[PDB]
């Protein structure tokens, strides 16, 4: 099976970690805080790492039956969290989460729906605190609580299938930091995370990471005053369905990917994409400015030692 | 070019009209309301129809700078609640940013929502340098609401409850879709009737045609998901679905690949893996539609299984009864 990479063009695709198109591509440099998504992560073979998941409305979500507080203004929500598949959550398995789980820390804010339910339909404003702040954002171990703002009481009783589904993060001074970049703790304050898929760092002098960029929401109770922010994913969704159904041997460490233009009727850079699941430019860190009406063509296998041509 | 379908498994999959899973296959017999999507249609040669984006994002939402308006018991109940709205007016434009073209090909910007219901919302300013802001919003798109006009360049977003003074002209908003409105006194969701997208006073132009299988005994196969409903916090009113004619993975394989069709449709069998054996077969016309030898109703079928391209056949080949 011969590799490829899709030919869609990167205004067309979307982010692994948030329910949003792609509108940049950034060049990230070797920071303190390492890259170590658990969301977007899939190898030029097909391999699902972490906590990645191919449907693209489960991404940065948690969903599964209502449950009792004891089996475990506002009204909290608490569920036995379970697979985008409606199958269960296997807590001892070789995932630090259910697919698709948040994989920053953050207050999201974003919709609790309860879209089956015979006696009605129900949802509610909501939010899921995934800083250490939270001590019930525990999905490692089978259970997470949300919070339905201002409104819910009488609707989350035990035995209902629900959804929380993402659409901003909290934002003001007053509020906790989003932080795309720091992973929260999935098993809460008290006990550890486990199979994390691995941190990513490019190796080679003079390759920096290529990011595929985002806008975030922001949430700020209706002030419109916080910084706008951005999120970042590794490899667009459908970079992901077509690797994984591909499932193409690597042979070698990195495909060699050049950035075509039509319009401008020439390749406009070129990137390696390693065979763990990222790409990488010899450039410096900032945004690239480059049209996104562009698509990825794969040219050839080479190894680490291949120096690229600067950006 | 060779043909071929996704391998990926029905509940891997996207519904090309609306953010959501899919979570069944069902089939609909050949009903006075006829289909006629006009989101998620793409033939087998990868031709996008309609409004059809390949931006997951895009599909049934609005987006494009704000204007100004110049520049464009239950009676009771509504009238109070709608004087604490505001009312948000957008010049649309196309999901890459670049503007819509009133005089193309297609009855509005890709994306646009192809159904009549209120569709509730989150309204989003996303990128402002005086700070970022978003709003609950709906947007009525039944022929009710005069204001529905995507296809002359301008559309109105309500804001339920507040954002006065954030609604300035010349920043950059999305509407993204979260669910209909539903409950007797609200209007009715209705995903197979078309909106007017010029509002009440024009007609729409360019429609991708409609989708009615032609053949005895076959009948239109759709891909369905939860369709989430908003009914002012009662949880009251009756749950709901939409459909679609291919998953989002469909539309991307078949539109990257471009492969030529070789015959009136492509013969798909769908496999089991732990069934270890083929289900059912279904014949996935060049038009951008599956049908299936099977009455109307749900297929009690696991979805764990994919769609394997078989062969191509002329539409009087005979399937298996599923």
Same mark, same amino acid.
Request: net charge negative; hydrophobic share 40%.
């Given at each position: ?203 080679? #002098?003079?390759?920096?990471?290529? %990011? +595929? /960029? ?10 419109? *005053? =916080? &910084? @706008? ?32 233009? #039509?319009?401008?009727?020439?390749? %406009? +850079? /070129? ?10 430019? *010899? =450039? &410096? @860190? ?26």
């Amino acid at each position: 099976v011969s590799f490829s990479v899709p030919g869609l063009v990167v205004e067309d695709m979307s982010n692994s970690r948030w329910p949003a198109q792609i509108n940049g591509l950034v060049v990230r440099g070797n920071e303190a805080q390492v890259v170590h998504f658990q969301n977007g992560r899939c190898t030029t073979e097909g391999t699902l790492l972490g906590t990645t998941t191919l449907s693209i409305n489960s991404i940065c979500g948690l969903r599964g039956l209502s449950v009792s507080q004891a089996s475990v203004a506002d009204t909290t929500l608490w569920l036995r969290v379970e697979e985008p598949d409606g199958r269960p959550y296997d807590i001892f398995g070789d995932q630090p989460a259910p697919l698709g789980t948040p994989d920053f820390t953050a207050v999201i804010v974003g919709t609790a729906i309860r879209p089956r339910t015979a006696s009605g339909a129900y949802l509610h404003d909501a939010y899921v605190d995934t800083t250490p702040g939270d001590a019930d954002f525990t999905p490692s171990t089978g259970n997470t609580k949300i919070v339905l703002r201002g409104g819910g009481s009488g609707h989350v009783g035990q035995g209902h299938y629900w959804q929380f589904r993402p659409i901003a993060v909290e934002g003001g001074g007053s509020r906790p930091q989003y932080q795309e970049y720091n992973l929260p703790d999935y098993a809460g304050p008290t006990a550890s995370n486990h199979d994390l898929a691995p941190p990513v760092a490019p190796r080679m #002098p003079g390759e920096l990471l290529l %990011l +595929f /960029e985002s806008d975030m929401p922001v949430w700020d109770n209706g002030a419109g *005053a =916080a &910084p @706008a922010q951005k999120i970042h994913c590794l490899l667009p969704n459908e970079f992901i369905t077509h690797l994984f159904d591909l499932q193409a041997p690597a042979l070698a460490e990195a495909a060699l990917l050049r950035y075509v233009h #039509p319009d401008s009727g020439r390749t %406009l +850079f /070129e990137c390696k994409l390693y065979r763990e699941g990222y790409m990488v430019v *010899a =450039a &410096p @860190a900032g945004r690239l400015n480059f049209p996104l009406d562009g698509y990825f063509r794969f040219d050839s296998w080479v190894s680490a030692f291949y120096i690229l041509s600067p950006v």
